[model samples]
Target: HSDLTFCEIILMEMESHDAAWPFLEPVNPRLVSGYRRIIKNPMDFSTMRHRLSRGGYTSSEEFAADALLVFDNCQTFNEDDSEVGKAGHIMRRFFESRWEEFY
Candidate 1:
């Protein structure tokens, strides 16, 4: 039963992590210049949550797709030395390890 909802649990874990702060919500195109332009298919935890609740994920790989996308987009949009950029890497590491051990 738990395996059936593992993706949801993983999402919750990611949301609570301190490193997920900046990625908790979608980047506002109006507020963050060039973000929308640079990352065409922007992904964030909030968007992922909505999709998850709406039965958007068919497999764990689907969930992982968006998870990795969040980090990839962050790395692409922000400087590697930037605070948010570092947070992305941290969050990605956490997710990858969790996925590895759980699956």
Candidate 2:
């Protein structure tokens, strides 16, 4: 089994973080109005985990994109002064630094 497990490990670590609370699951469009309209391609840790099981990513770099997608989407939808946005920054740093360790 190659290095595919790396991304999964990173995802699990991110999920365990306190800042990851808002991102643990998909954004509820009903609760957060206009979420679907703004984030055309919404992503979350849960969705990425599911995709990983199906071997949806071609490489670690692609997986990284998907990982960052969640944070980037958060940035776009919420204000940096807000809770979710702040957590997005933290998670992004956590992910990028950890990702650098291997790739």
Local distance difference test, each candidate: 0.89, 0.88
Error of 2 at 98 (Å): 0.5
Show how many residue pairs clash in every candidate, following the order shown.
0, 0
Score candidate 1 by TM-score against the native.
0.93
Return the TM-score for each candidate structure: 0.93, 0.93
Cα lDDT tens digits, model 2, 26-47, are 9899999898889999999999
Which lDDT value does model 1 have at 13?
Answer: 96
Off by over 4 Å in 1: 1-4
lDDT of 1 by residue, 1-103 (tens): 4553888888999999999998999889999988777998989999999998888777778889999999999889988889998998899899999898888
